Structure 1
Amino acid sequence: DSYKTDISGRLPKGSTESLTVSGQPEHKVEAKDSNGMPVDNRQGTITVSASG
C-alpha cells in the first residue's frame, strides 16, 4: 500500500574512509544482563578500524 508523506526523515552524508571491522564480531542472544536487567537483543556492539 502506498501513501504520500509531507514530513520525511534524512540519512546523513556518510564517511569516505576505508573502514573495516576489527576482530571477527559475533554476538549472543541473552534474556538477562549480569545485573539481571533485560538485554535488547535488537542491537549489539562492534569495533571498527577508525572513528568515521
Structure 2
Amino acid sequence: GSTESLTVSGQPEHKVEAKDSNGMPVDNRQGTITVSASGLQVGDAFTIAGVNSVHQITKDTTGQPQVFRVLAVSGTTVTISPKILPVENTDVASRPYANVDAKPAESAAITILNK
C-alpha cells in the first residue's frame, strides 16, 4: 500500500564512443541516476517512461519499454544497464545499432520490478 510516484532526477546519457583512453573501440555502458523513487539496490529490473526499445524484430521499432538491470547503487545513485542509446539521434552511423528510440528528458518515471 504505497504510492506509485517513482521518478528520477538527473540525466542519464552516454554516446557510442569511437575509442577510449587506450584508443580502442568502445561499446559504452551504464547510466547513473539520482532517484526520487523506491530506494533501489543492486538486482532490480525496471522500465522507464519514454525509453522504448528498438530492433526487436530486425531493426523493428515496437515502442516496447526497455528493461534495465541494476549494477551498483550508492545511496540514491543507481548505476543501471543496459545503457540507453537513441536510434532516432546519436549519429547517422551509430544510431542503427542503438537500443532505444531516444534518451528522454532527465530520467523520468520508473516502473519497478523485482522479477
TM-score range, shorter chain: 0.3 to 0.5
Relative to its length, the structure with more strand (as a share) is 2
TM-score normalised over the length of structure 1: 0.36
Which has more radius of gyration? 1
Higher RCO (Cα < 8 Å, 6 or more apart): 1
